[PDB]
Each structure stands twice: as structure tokens, then as C-alpha cells.
């Protein structure tokens, strides 16, 4: 099993005669703090089901981060629409320096030491997607020598 954290829980509305009627969403990451994270987005008529629905997707889309002594191997800059995330490798006693969104994403991934920065649209849902697709594009010296 994994450690699980709810990063976002929001309410949205739609309109029809008689007035507004709501729907809830939850951005949820899940991970072992040992090289495995997954991000899931769940929407439902009530908070709990959405949180649970989210968790199922989180496990449905996962990714394997090549941790090297608790930091990422190389620079990664990634855009997701108008959102940009910078992940920069950091030495031992550094700490995890990121906003509560990529913080929880990287944290549950076993990342213990990292310099980061959000640029552009800091919309919670998009910055999430950009942090993940960044990891999914992380490589190591092995991976490289094998390609080339």
C-alpha cells in the first residue's frame, strides 16, 4: 500500500432552471516515498466519493522516479499549457523547497532534496500535471547510454 495525500478539494457548479447544482473534485497524489508516485483526479456529487474516486485513478496512472540519494538526476523544465515547473537537483542537507502542490507530489515520491520553482499559470490542477510529466521525463546515465 501507499501513503496518500489530498492536495486539492474543490466545489464547482453548473446551471439549470431552479438554480445552481454542485459537483466536487479532488486532486490526489499517492506514493510509497521510495520511487513511486501517481496522480489522480476525481469528481463526484459529494466530497468523500470524489476523494475515493480520485485515489483509484491515482493508482491507475503511476510513474517511476529515479531517485539518486534522494534527489533527481538532472534539470527538468516542463510546460503544461500555460503552466511551467522547474525541478532542479539539490545536494544533501537542502530540503524540499516547493509549493504545497509539487511539494506533496515529490514528497510522496521519496524526493527528500530538491530545488523547485513554479512559473506561469500556477493553477493547482495544471501545475500538478506539469510536475508529473516532468518526472515521467527524468532519465539516468544508464537510460542514456542504452538509447545511444
Amino acid at each position: 500500500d501507499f501513503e496518500e495525500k489530498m492536495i486539492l478539494i474543490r466545489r464547482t457548479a453548473r446551471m439549470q432552471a431552479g438554480g445552481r447544482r454542485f459537483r466536487f473534485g479532488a486532486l490526489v497524489v499517492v506514493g510509497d516515498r521510495q520511487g513511486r508516485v501517481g496522480l489522480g483526479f476525481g469528481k463526484a456529487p459529494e466530497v468523500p466519493l470524489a476523494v475515493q474516486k480520485a485515489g483509484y485513478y491515482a493508482r491507475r496512472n503511476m510513474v517511476e522516479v529515479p531517485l539518486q540519494n534522494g534527489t533527481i538526476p538532472h534539470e527538468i523544465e516542463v510546460e503544461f499549457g500555460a503552466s511551467k515547473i522547474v525541478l532542479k537537483p539539490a545536494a544533501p542537507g537542502t530540503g524540499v523547497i516547493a509549493g504545497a502542490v509539487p511539494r506533496a507530489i515529490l514528497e510522496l515520491a521519496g524526493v527528500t532534496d530538491i530545488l523547485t520553482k513554479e512559473l506561469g499559470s500556477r493553477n493547482p490542477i495544471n501545475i500538478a500535471y506539469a510536475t508529473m510529466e516532468a518526472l515521467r521525463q527524468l532519465r539516468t546515465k544508464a537510460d542514456v547510454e542504452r538509447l545511444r
Binding site: 538532472h74 534539470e75 537537483p89 538509447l147 545511444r148
Partner: protein
């Protein structure tokens, strides 16, 4: 046409984004020196001086990864990234001490130096600097 190198790097970048076997660039002794490094460092299979309709070109043999399982079968790239640094607009040189480390080692930076075209590594071994032509990973 105002930049041969920038055209060259670009001719490739388009060719690799739709997985062509090769693509041809107009020939130059300077392009051979860059393709040479691009050959040795293994971003491409290699190249050869061919001729098109009476005109000298260089045919460059591209290299990719394996097919992938999933909705997107398209194999990973070998040249993920390639882009000019120094340009006719804004010349870029670096002394030895400020020579960059591309992508935490996993990539290269090509140079024009008074000792020839060298990588970030080579330049530091020989102890010389030069115009930072481009970066690749």
C-alpha cells in the same frame, strides 16, 4: 539564408520529430566537424557526403529508441533537444571556467575553439574555451 548551423540543427529536429531514417543538409567543413561530434557522441548513427542534383549535401542517419507499448507507440527520441546558443544576432563565447554542464552531465555542449570543435568535457581536458555553438541531449 542567414544561418547554416541553425538551419542544420533545425533540419534534423524536424526529421527526428517524425522519425525519418535520414535527412540531408548542405555541406560544410564546419558542419562535418559538428556532425562528427554528433556522430561520436552517438546522437546519430553517422553521416556521409552525398550529392543532390549536382549539388553537395550531407546525408545524416538518424537514430531512435524502441517501439513502446501503449496508446502512443512512438519510440523515444535520441536527440530530445538541440538548439543554437551563439547566433549571428548575438555571438556567445565562454572562457574555460564558465563552460556549462548540459543537463547535469547527461548531455553535451558543442564548441568552436582554436583547437577545433570540442565538447564541454573535451574543452575542460584540453583547457581551452570557445564560441558555444549549441547544446544537445
Amino acid at each position: 539564408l542567414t544561418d547554416p548551423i541553425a538551419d542544420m540543427l533545425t533540419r534534423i529536429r524536424n526529421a527526428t520529430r517524425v522519425y525519418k531514417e535520414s535527412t540531408d543538409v548542405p555541406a560544410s567543413r564546419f558542419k562535418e566537424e559538428i556532425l562528427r561530434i554528433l556522430a561520436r557522441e552517438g546522437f546519430i548513427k553517422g553521416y556521409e557526403r552525398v550529392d543532390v542534383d549536382g549539388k553537395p549535401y550531407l546525408r545524416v542517419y538518424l537514430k531512435y529508441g524502441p517501439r513502446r507499448q501503449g496508446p502512443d507507440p512512438r519510440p523515444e527520441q535520441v536527440i530530445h533537444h538541440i538548439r543554437r546558443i551563439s547566433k549571428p544576432g548575438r555571438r556567445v563565447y565562454v572562457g574555460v571556467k564558465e563552460i556549462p554542464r548540459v543537463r547535469r552531465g547527461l548531455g553535451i555542449a558543442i564548441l568552436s575553439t582554436s583547437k577545433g570543435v570540442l565538447t564541454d568535457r573535451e574543452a575542460r581536458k584540453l583547457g581551452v574555451g570557445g564560441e558555444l555553438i549549441c547544446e544537445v541531449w
